[PDB]
């Protein structure tokens, strides 16, 4: 049972590497191997100091390794010590805040975005007094820094990219070298991405796959004389490191050595190192998914691929006797439950009787199932798959029978009448093949006659069908009640509250029950007739809102409603959508609130029990009769039991299967998938930790050589995330005191855009921080750490300014201050542009193409669009999908004005730019950022300035998570530009005018991209 | 200001964009806070609005807030120590349910500004023993001391600061058809914000207009 | 009811006469009703080879600019999914040729 070895470093005969998230050292001389540091969290990088005594270590924390910081290790005494309290943000693909290199004097130089407004701005800092002080190098963003003959060698974006092999986009690793104690010149800029640079002698060795596979290469300190030193074919090599004589690296889970003076390569022998307990315990709630109420007040729920039948208290629990991957569980009868079991071949329907214990499992493959339901009479089930089919599965035999197939999207919204005769479901459709909107009409299937009827027309979005208990009327919801709501900031309108319920009597001549038409005056007593039933449709007199479910009851109707809300929290913090359960009294037509703070709701088969999840993440249950008597469903009374290796195999196979099933190109997916399966599967048994599996899974994802192949979430550690104490200030260790070097502020009047000290009416800049909460900080006291320990609370800060100017304030210590830095930056650039253009040019920055991008764009657009010129800076733009909505605004051509009796002119359109526009972009703008960039040029909105962009334009829409919560993404939607095809993918967008931002530009404190933008517009504005 | 004794009117300030109808007078009759419409450019498509404060003593005008958005409904607390007001600065988009679109529906939030530098936002409940106030009036750079009050963003039309609570008039998001073709009035509700428990509650609904005693 | 009936009649007519190759949208005014009707049909009629934008009898108002903006969107890309159909970029763009109809009652 060998281990997966990776990320090595060497110094003489000693070699340190990572195994089971812990750091190990191996001695070539004796062949001995030992663990020198552990239990710190997941370690992904370790770097020997010059002397080969101390070791800089990067360790990640937070269940999803969302945070990171650096530690020192002194091999002499075995002392460990945290050096940075930045709590840097990191992701698999972008594992920022690391060791950048060491200076001649042996000082550690780190790369971090911790104090920058943008994550890609991983600036270089020289560590001092072990974290007490940080000195900026001002060489701009950089991943590696080397020193050759007193010359600084800069590696930009030179980290490894295992998730995207063959990458040739604008963000590809490049190398620069100093030529004149400040003058820099780019020396290595190949077609492909260059990573892990090192210097042995007078040559730079790095990795690249310019030839189709990862190999080590090298060139002189001028980038000339290229040479290929390896010919690997099994697994890409990674993480180059050296001591000055030999080069170390990992491959296929093993450590190799490359001697440049011999060009000889050999695998170091390590063998078994650690095999932890395979059987692990987990908190069922942590991975809980799918919670459904059963007869007898029992509960069923899925967690980590396992299923359980339990009482609400969680005292009596039954595990479903079925191997890994149960996707869904559903009431199938008195004591029976149907479930969906997922394997590598696909999804299958199964049944389990928890009373007798029997549990048959059909072998008919249903495809990839995304919805499942059983009729009240336990005769058949209804299932939806990714083939866009809706079908019934005979619970007796197992024979699936397709009712209908949509060619636009999945048919997951359905319901079965109580007499098991009809099936109503939303049927996605389009009027035209290239239509920008997918409509949805409700369809009804009659088991007798086996014919499909149209419950509704196909002009909008109809959903949430529901039959009444008697099976006489079909209720459902629609977004057909068009009525606009005004925007409070921008001249705009949207449909916020246009949802309304409707009903359809299954017996013609029968009226809308909620209309309360006297029975004596209605001559019903007809029979079922679903023909032209969409013509009998009728609404129910309920105020329009945003409804997600309707449940018709005897003398009332329950409706789930979601108040209008912003999307920022849900978009960047996973914040759940808050709903409320309403009750509509059919007789009095009065509406009331039955339960709030809900995030999800399920209803019993007999409509008597209600199960819900609230905003606190907990699950509750209450009788529909007395909603005041709800109980909390306890699930953690019993530990979840599983096998690391069984899960790892299962997860790998699922990841591999998703990667294949969702890749945008089916043909390609066939060859790529089959050609990489076994190769990466062989490494799975060597994985003992989640982080191990990650290394394997991402590498197999890279095989698709496409963008947007990510791995998010998941549980890698149980260590609490690193914390960081921030007050939006920059400290400088001057003498033996810290002085506020800079006090950040954007718009003083907005929320959260300045240092909390400003609220006391003073600018902290220039003041000295005497102490925090009675503790002296300065020369012998790391202010970053002290703040670290007060994050999230208020601490008394003692400040000293000009003369006897002493202040004693309770300051809020933020957990983060990135946004404050960001807005400060934007307002700085905005002031700068107004001053350099003499008030003739506006400025707008777009951070991403998501909700934040929409906020920032308008935040300035409403004040900067009416200058003679306008700069639209989209540098560092994280992408998303709103580029089209922004381009639309910029596209507005001003063709008129409004002349008032009093006041000033009003431009028409209101949302139009007044003059010339100029766009600025760089290699850190990507995806929807690439699209916006290409678009700006294509529509001729203006000139594009900067450097070629990222190049990743194959979008994603994940719809599955691994049994551990992990969310993998698959490039499923290839963007095609007319007159460019898919060309932008793996290339990016070239600017009209290329303006590099070299390291010496940063040393001079000048932004060449923005200056050119200004100068250029000024030149264009002379007419 | 018009001297109620003689009748002599005295112009404080003039906007060149729109009327200055949103204003308030502190209880000690010393300051006058009002929304001042302005534009960055003459042909600008949007009119901004910043709150201005006029000091009867010194007869000088100060900038209570920056001019990057829409600030309104100024209100002084009875003690005349803090200036409360509202803003549409809390940008956060809401999705359209039919068309690929987004708009700013709930981006209104209240803010406060202490008239005495060094004094904290009263609703922050900073222990008095830990705050060294006891200063004097200083309206310079007061927009820098601005602070928000911890209330969920919404669509507020008025804020009334009271002793241990704050009243706020809120208007739920609604369609415009009825108001546009049937003169249908805008329905609001009067909310109460308890400064101590930070809990909000409904005081009165189905409101279309509200006035408050002296 | 008479109005929407009229609109659907003209809409059916245009689809039949162009043999399913031309869409139809009517804008009654430039107020809230106009915004409703424009989108009510825009989301289903914008992807035909051609599109007729009938603004006859349009009572005016002020949202002409917001509608013109939608019609100004030029389609320059597409989205290719593993399953399903193409998605146009921008989403709110007309696919083909546009033709406008107006009379002395549009003002």
């Amino acid at each position: 049972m060998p281990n997966l070895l990776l990320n090595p470093d060497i110094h003489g005969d000693r070699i340190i590497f990572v195994c089971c998230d812990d750091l190990w050292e191996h001695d070539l001389k004796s062949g001995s191997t030992r663990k020198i540091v552990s239990n710190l969290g997941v370690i992904n990088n370790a770097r020997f100091f010059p002397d080969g005594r101390k070791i800089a270590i990067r360790v990640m924390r937070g269940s999803s390794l969302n945070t990171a910081d650096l530690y020192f290790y002194n091999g002499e005494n075995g002392e460990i010590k945290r050096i940075t309290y930045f709590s840097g943000k990191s992701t698999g693909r972008r594992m920022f805040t690391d060791v950048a290199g060491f200076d001649p004097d042996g000082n550690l130089i780190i790369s971090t975005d911790a104090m920058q407004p943008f994550s890609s701005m991983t600036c270089l800092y020289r560590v001092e007094n072990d974290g007490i002080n940080f000195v900026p190098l001002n060489l701009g963003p950089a991943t590696h820094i080397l020193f050759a003959d007193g010359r600084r060698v800069i590696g930009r974006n030179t980290f490894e990219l295992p998730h995207w092999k063959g990458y040739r986009g604008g963000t590809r690793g490049k190398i620069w070298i100093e030529v004149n104690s400040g003058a820099f010149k780019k020396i290595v800029d190949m077609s492909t991405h260059v990573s892990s640079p090192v210097i042995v002698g007078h040559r730079i060795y790095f990795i690249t796959d310019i030839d189709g596979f990862g190999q080590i290469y090298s060139t002189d300190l001028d980038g000339k004389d290229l040479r290929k030193h390896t010919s690997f074919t099994d697994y890409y090599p990674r993480h180059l490191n050296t001591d000055g004589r030999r080069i170390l690296f990992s491959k296929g889970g093993s450590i190799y050595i490359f001697n440049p003076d011999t060009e000889k390569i050999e695998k170091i022998e390590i063998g078994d190192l650690e095999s932890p307990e395979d059987r692990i315990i987990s908190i069922p709630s942590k991975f809980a998914e799918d919670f459904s109420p059963l007869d007898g007040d029992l509960i069923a729920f899925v967690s980590r691929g396992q299923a359980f039948i339990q009482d609400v208290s969680g005292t009596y629990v039954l595990k479903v006797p079925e191997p890994l991957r149960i996707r869904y569980v559903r009431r199938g009868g008195d004591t029976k439950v149907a479930f969906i079991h997922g394997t590598r071949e696909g999804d299958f329907l199964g049944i389990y009787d928890y009373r007798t214990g029997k549990a048959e499992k059909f072998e008919e493959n249903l495809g990839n199932v995304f919805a499942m339901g059983v009729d009240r009479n336990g005769k058949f089930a209804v299932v939806a798959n990714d083939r866009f089919e809706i079908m019934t599965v005979d619970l007796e035999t197992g024979k699936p029978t397709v009712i209908e197939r949509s060619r636009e999207a999945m048919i997951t919204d359905f319901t079965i009448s109580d007499n098991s005769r009809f099936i109503a479901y939303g049927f996605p459709l389009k009027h035209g093949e290239t239509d920008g909107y997918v409509m949805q009409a409700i369809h009804v299937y009659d088991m007798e006659g086996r014919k499909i009827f149209a419950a509704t027309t196909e002009n909008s979005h109809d959903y949430a069908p529901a039959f009444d208990a008697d099976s006489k009327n079909l209720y459902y919801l629609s977004y057909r009640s068009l009525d606009p709501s005004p925007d409070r900031v921008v001249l705009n309108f949207s449909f916020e509250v246009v949802s309304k319920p409707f009903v359809i009597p299954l017996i013609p001549g029968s009226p809308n029950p909620t209309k309360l038409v006297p029975r004596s005056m209605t001559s019903e007593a007809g029979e079922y007739d679903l023909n032209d039933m969409y013509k009998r449709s009728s609404p129910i007199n309920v105020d329009p809102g945003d409804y997600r479910m309707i449940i018709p009851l005897e003398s009332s109707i329950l409706i789930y409603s979601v108040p209008v809300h912003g999307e920022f929290a849900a978009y960047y913090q996973g914040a759940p959508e808050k709903g409320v359960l309403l009750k509509y009294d059919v007789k009095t037509r009065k509406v009331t609130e039955v339960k709030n703070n809900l995030t999800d709701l399920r209803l019993s088969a007999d409509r008597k029990t209600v199960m819900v999840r609230k905003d606190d993440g907990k699950i509750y249950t209450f009788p529909l009769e007395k909603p005041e008597d709800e109980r909390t469903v306890e699930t953690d009374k019993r530990p979840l039991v599983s096998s690391i290796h069984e899960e790892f195999l299962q997860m790998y196979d699922e990841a591999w299967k998703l990667a294949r099933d969702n890749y945008w190109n089916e043909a390609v997916a066939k060859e790529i998938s089959e050609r990489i399966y076994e190769k990466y599967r062989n490494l799975v048994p060597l994985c003992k930790t989640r982080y191990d599996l990650s290394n394997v899974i991402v590498e197999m994802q890279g095989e698709y050589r496409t963008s947007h192949s990510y791995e998010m979430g998941g549980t890698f550690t149980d260590k609490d995330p690193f914390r960081s104490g921030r007050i939006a200030c920059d400290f400088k260790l001057d003498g033996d005191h810290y002085v506020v070097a800079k006090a950040y502020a954007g718009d003083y009047s907005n929320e959260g855009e300045k240092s909390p000290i400003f609220e006391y009416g003073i600018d902290p800049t220039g003041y000295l921080i005497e102490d925090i909460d009675g503790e002296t900080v300065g020369a012998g006291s790391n202010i970053y750490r002290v703040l670290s320990e007060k994050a999230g609370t208020s601490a008394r800060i003692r400040l000293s300014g000009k003369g006897g100017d002493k202040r004693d304030l309770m300051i809020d210590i933020l957990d983060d201050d990135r946004f404050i830095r960001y807005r400060s930056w934007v307002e700085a650039n905005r002031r700068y542009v107004h001053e350099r253009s003499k008030g003739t040019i506006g400025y707008i920055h777009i951070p991403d193409m998501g909700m934040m991008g929409l906020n920032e764009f308008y935040r300035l657009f409403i004040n900067e669009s009416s200058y003679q010129g306008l700069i639209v800076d989209v540098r560092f733009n994280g992408g998303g999908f709103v580029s089209q909505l922004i381009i639309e605004k910029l596209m507005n051509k001003r063709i008129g004005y409004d002349n008032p009796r009093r006041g000033t002119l009003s431009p028409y359109p209101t949302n139009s730019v007044r003059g010339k526009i100029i766009a600025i972009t760089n290699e850190y703008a990507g995806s929807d950022g690439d699209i916006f960039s290409f678009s700006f040029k294509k529509l001729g909105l203006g000139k594009l300035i900067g450097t070629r962009t990222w190049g990743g334009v194959v979008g994603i829409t994940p719809k599955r998570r691994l049994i551990d919560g992990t969310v993998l993404t698959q490039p499923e939607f290839a963007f095609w530009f007319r007159d460019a095809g898919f060309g932008v993918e793996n290339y990016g967008v070239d600017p009209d005018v290329e303006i590099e931002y070299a390291p010496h530009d940063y040393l001079s404190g000048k932004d060449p991209q923005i200056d050119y933008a200004i100068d250029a517009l000024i030149e264009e504005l002379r007419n | 200001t018009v001297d109620l004794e003689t009748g002599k009117p005295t112009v404080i300030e003039r906007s060149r964009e729109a009327m200055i109808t949103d204003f308030t007078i502190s209880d000690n009759s010393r300051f006058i806070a009002y929304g001042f419409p302005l534009k960055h450019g003459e042909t600008d498509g949007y009119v901004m609005q910043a709150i201005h404060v006029y000091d009867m003593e010194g007869r000088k005008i100060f900038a209570a807030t920056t001019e990057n958005s829409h600030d309104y409904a100024p209100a002084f607390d009875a003690d005349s120590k803090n200036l409360y007001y509202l803003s549409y600065r809390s940008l956060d988009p809401s999705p359209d349910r039919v068309v690929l679109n987004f708009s700013f529906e709930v981006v209104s939030k209240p803010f406060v500004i202490p008239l005495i530098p060094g004094s904290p936002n009263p609703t922050k409940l900073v222990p008095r023993s830990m705050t060294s106030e006891a200063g004097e009036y200083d309206l310079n750079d007061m927009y820098k001391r601005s602070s928000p009050i911890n209330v969920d963003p919404g669509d507020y039309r008025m804020i009334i600061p009271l002793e241990s609570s704050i009243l706020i008039y809120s208007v739920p998001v609604h369609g415009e058809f009825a108001a546009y073709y049937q003169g249908a009035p805008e329905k609001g509700v009067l909310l109460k914000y308890d400064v101590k428990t930070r809990k909000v509650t409904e005081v009165k609904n189905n409101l279309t207009d509200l006035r408050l005693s002296a | 009811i008479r109005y929407r009936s009229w609109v659907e009649a003209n809409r059916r007519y245009v689809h039949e006469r162009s043999k399913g190759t031309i869409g139809y949208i009517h804008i009654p005014d430039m107020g809230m009703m106009g915004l409703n009707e424009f989108y009510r049909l825009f989301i289903n009629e914008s992807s035909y080879q051609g599109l007729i934008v009938d603004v006859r009898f349009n009572g005016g108002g002020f949202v002409s600019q917001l509608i013109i903006e939608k019609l100004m969107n030029k389609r320059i890309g597409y989205d290719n999914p593993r399953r399903g159909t193409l998605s146009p970029y921008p989403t709110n763009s007309v696919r083909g040729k546009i033709i406008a109809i107006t009379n002395e009652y549009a003002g």
């Binding site: 409004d898 | 309104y72 207009d209 | 430039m30 108002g61 002020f62 002409s64």
Partner: peptide, 11 residues
């Protein structure tokens, strides 16, 4: 009446 009763120019 309110502080958001929009007043735009009608045509």
């Amino acid at each position: 009446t309110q502080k958001a009763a929009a007043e735009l120019t009608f045509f």
